[PDB]
Design a protein around this ligand. Sequence first.
Ligand SMILES: [Mg+2]
Ligand SMILES: [Mg+2]
Ligand SMILES: [Mg+2]
Ligand SMILES: [Mg+2]
Ligand SMILES: [Mg+2]
Ligand SMILES: [Mg+2]
Ligand SMILES: [Mg+2]
Ligand SMILES: [Mg+2]
Ligand SMILES: [Mg+2]
Ligand SMILES: [Mg+2]
Ligand SMILES: [Mg+2]
Ligand SMILES: [Mg+2]
Ligand SMILES: [Mg+2]
Ligand SMILES: [Mg+2]
Ligand SMILES: [Mg+2]
Ligand SMILES: [Mg+2]
Ligand SMILES: [Mg+2]
Ligand SMILES: [Mg+2]
Ligand SMILES: [Mg+2]
Ligand SMILES: [Mg+2]
Ligand SMILES: [Mg+2]
Ligand SMILES: [Mg+2]
Ligand SMILES: [Mg+2]
Ligand SMILES: [Mg+2]
Ligand SMILES: [Mg+2]
Ligand SMILES: [Mg+2]
Ligand SMILES: [Mg+2]
Ligand SMILES: [Mg+2]
Ligand SMILES: [Mg+2]
Ligand SMILES: [Mg+2]
Ligand SMILES: [Mg+2]
Ligand SMILES: [Mg+2]
Ligand SMILES: [Mg+2]
Ligand SMILES: [Mg+2]
Ligand SMILES: [Zn+2]
Lengths: 116, 60, 23, 127, 155, 97, 83
Amino acid sequence: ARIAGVEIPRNKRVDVALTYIYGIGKARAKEALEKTGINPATRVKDLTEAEVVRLREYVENTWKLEGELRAEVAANIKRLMDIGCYRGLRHRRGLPVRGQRTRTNARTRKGPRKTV
Amino acid sequence: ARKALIEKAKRTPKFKVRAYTRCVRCGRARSVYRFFGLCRICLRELAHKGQLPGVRKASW
Amino acid sequence: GKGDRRTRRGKIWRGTYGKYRPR
Amino acid sequence: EQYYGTGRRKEAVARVFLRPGNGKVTVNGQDFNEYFQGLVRAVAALEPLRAVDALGHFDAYITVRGGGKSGQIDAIKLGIARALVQYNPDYRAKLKPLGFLTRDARVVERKKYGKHKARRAPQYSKR
Amino acid sequence: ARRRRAEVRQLQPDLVYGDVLVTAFINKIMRDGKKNLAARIFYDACKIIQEKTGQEPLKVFKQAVENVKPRMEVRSRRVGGANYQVPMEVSPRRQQSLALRWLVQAANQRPERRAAVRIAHELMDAAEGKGGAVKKKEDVERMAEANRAYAHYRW
Amino acid sequence: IRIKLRGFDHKTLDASAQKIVEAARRSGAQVSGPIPLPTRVRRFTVIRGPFKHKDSREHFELRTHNRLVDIINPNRKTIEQLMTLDLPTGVEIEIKT
Amino acid sequence: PRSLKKGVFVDDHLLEKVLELNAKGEKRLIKTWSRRSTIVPEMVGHTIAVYNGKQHVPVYITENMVGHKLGEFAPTRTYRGHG
RNA sequence: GCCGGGCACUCUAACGGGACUGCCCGCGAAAGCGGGAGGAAGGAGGGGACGACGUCUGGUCAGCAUGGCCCUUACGGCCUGGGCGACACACGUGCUACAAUGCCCACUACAAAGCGAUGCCACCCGGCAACGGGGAGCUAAUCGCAAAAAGGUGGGCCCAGUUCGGAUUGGGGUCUGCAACCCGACCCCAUGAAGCCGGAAUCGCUAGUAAUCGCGGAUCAGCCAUGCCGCGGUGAAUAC
Ligand SMILES: [Mg+2]
Ligand SMILES: [Mg+2]
Ligand SMILES: [Mg+2]
Ligand SMILES: [Mg+2]
Ligand SMILES: [Mg+2]
Ligand SMILES: [Mg+2]
Ligand SMILES: [Mg+2]
Ligand SMILES: [Mg+2]
Ligand SMILES: [Mg+2]
Ligand SMILES: [Mg+2]
Ligand SMILES: [Mg+2]
Ligand SMILES: [Mg+2]
Ligand SMILES: [Mg+2]
Ligand SMILES: [Mg+2]
Ligand SMILES: [Mg+2]
Ligand SMILES: [Mg+2]
Ligand SMILES: [Mg+2]
Ligand SMILES: [Mg+2]
Ligand SMILES: [Mg+2]
Ligand SMILES: [Mg+2]
Ligand SMILES: [Mg+2]
Ligand SMILES: [Mg+2]
Ligand SMILES: [Mg+2]
Ligand SMILES: [Mg+2]
Ligand SMILES: [Mg+2]
Ligand SMILES: [Mg+2]
Ligand SMILES: [Mg+2]
Ligand SMILES: [Mg+2]
Ligand SMILES: [Mg+2]
Ligand SMILES: [Mg+2]
Ligand SMILES: [Mg+2]
Ligand SMILES: [Mg+2]
Ligand SMILES: [Mg+2]
Ligand SMILES: [Mg+2]
Ligand SMILES: [Zn+2]
């Protein structure tokens, strides 16, 4: 896989493709293409192996991405769950965490309706 | 909780956040207009009587 | 869009400002 | 030297000035086609001059206030028509059959309490 | 409705062809009261049936209109314990409405990606007696012909 | 040189808005007329009954009409006689220069 | 959250009890109604009884659970599920 | 419109006029009905205010009033905390969507009604930003809220669970407030769920209406407002 650890979509503009990475959004895309002087409009198939490794090297070195990103956030909930925080019990009982009503909706955390 | 509440309402509190308006005519805690000092019920009652200066029904 | 805060149309909906809707 | 009619439509008010000249038309300090660009509904505002063959014969200074671009357009369409009737009283024939002198009181209806809008009622469920 | 028949709204003739029928067509195209876009959408297609077909746009439009206008339709009527589909002539008023409606409806069924083009090609197909716009009219007519049995049931 | 006239009822505003303007028009000399400024309106909308019944309200309004008059060429014969004027209860005045 | 420019909030009266005990060496029990408080570095190792509206809940504080509020460790609701 | 100068025009806001089947043809015993004219307006001009005797032993002893019945170291009262915000589920009203008649960025137009002296806050500066420090005007047709938005011009996206959609969560900040754990809003980085147009069934609207677009106000420290009361922009289809 190309960058970073994943193979971003060839045939799209280089800035959109990057967002197909866990950890890089629209902001971080234009932000990587600034500090490398790479045209935000060009199709990924049309990068130099030079442009590749430059764009490659910045992104991988500045930000935590794919695997490790998931890993910390995991550990972040891991600890929150394990200290017995209120936000912990909500993760451990699988319910929502941010002061939403649960009497209705709440589905995205709860899952499909378990009818009775 | 009633008369002790209209009375608790006027006295200056333990923190200024706790200021709440009580309709000066009947003591209603809800729907109290700043301009008159009244609740939407008394609002209508005094008005209909014609004891509210300059106040009249809107028709457009 | 109208529910998407990170856009122009989105912040007009809320009636607030930011990088995604400047004043 | 000049001919003025008052044009109204909705919240839009039209101060229109007819003056013999090439056929130049101006709204709020811009050329007509600049101020109404891409508005297909525009070219019809300059209709009453076709009612009496005035396409080239007059110039126009025009201010406009209130409403929107198409409410402002209909006011103009009235005002230049309004202004012609003074420049030549005999122009009444071939202006009334076009309804160019008449102005419609058609305006946005009051939002009514107990409704979503002026008429859209809230949706209702019995059983 | 109940008291007196409705007064048929006379439209403003379109500014590009002076036509009271194109205007109507526009409105059936117009979503959300955004006529400006719907006007262009039509007008662009005129340019598009100009490119691919060198003759008057308005001419393609009016024949296609005529080829989608249905002369008969069946219309419901429950006599007894069944709802009998009675055939009736379509008034010129209604033919136009259904034709203009199906034109746009069939137009929006097309796969080409821009609204201007969809209108163009369906008008290209409709004036030449092809397309879904007709596939609706033929359907409506066979349905009517099929029930000449119940033809005596006219109101 | 400025007179400002403000009340809740306009038919008593225009009475007093003319009366002050007649006075200065008497004792010299310039009256720039009773110019009626736009009214500032505070509507009150309220559910009719004391309990529930949301889809039925009543509309009340309060009209604070405005007036302005300009006595331009002073003539302090006006400076004394205005200090004695018969301006009815429901109306306020503000005097500037 | 609590505006960074201002303070890190602890109810005056409770902070003192921790600090008094710090001198003497901790720890007795601390019945409190201070949910609005922040757990604060001086509090580690103490055992604080937080009022959840009902009970005084015994919470041993650790080096890991510092930046939070107290009441996050005294649950306000009892829930065992349905059915 | 910055100064002279003017109130003509737009306007502001009070007092009038005007519309009455009054005129014409006609059908009619009449009242009226079809048509014609003049006229901005035509046959109740559009909308509003306004709801008969009664019905529902309708609703509200929790806005208030009130008979009576009941309590008196308490069924009264003061406080700190919590609950009213729970969640195997079911229903009502809604918001935002599933996209190209669309999404996004830049530049560029045209409303109205309101609101505002520990109030709205021009403008300048620090900040990606919410905001923060300066600071002018306005008891407000003067100053501010203020950009209206859909629209127009240009450019990008190219039919993809996507540059559609913005829920869920992680991390970091601003503000209001004594205090945002339960339980506020907002800003930013990252995460980017369901959803490809909805089963039986079912709602609204007859024209400046429906649909779509933004703006304000009441309550109000802040706000869970996508609610409500209004306001304009654009603007249909159809009634045999
Ligand atoms: Mg990404
Ligand atoms: Mg909750
Ligand atoms: Mg009482
Ligand atoms: Mg409060
Ligand atoms: Mg109150
Ligand atoms: Mg988006
Ligand atoms: Mg939409
Ligand atoms: Mg044009
Ligand atoms: Mg409207
Ligand atoms: Mg409702
Ligand atoms: Mg109901
Ligand atoms: Mg069809
Ligand atoms: Mg005059
Ligand atoms: Mg009649
Ligand atoms: Mg009963
Ligand atoms: Mg009672
Ligand atoms: Mg009683
Ligand atoms: Mg509740
Ligand atoms: Mg359901
Ligand atoms: Mg809702
Ligand atoms: Mg729903
Ligand atoms: Mg996905
Ligand atoms: Mg909170
Ligand atoms: Mg996306
Ligand atoms: Mg799916
Ligand atoms: Mg698709
Ligand atoms: Mg849809
Ligand atoms: Mg549907
Ligand atoms: Mg069915
Ligand atoms: Mg109706
Ligand atoms: Mg306000
Ligand atoms: Mg607010
Ligand atoms: Mg919430
Ligand atoms: Mg709003
Ligand atoms: Zn009251």
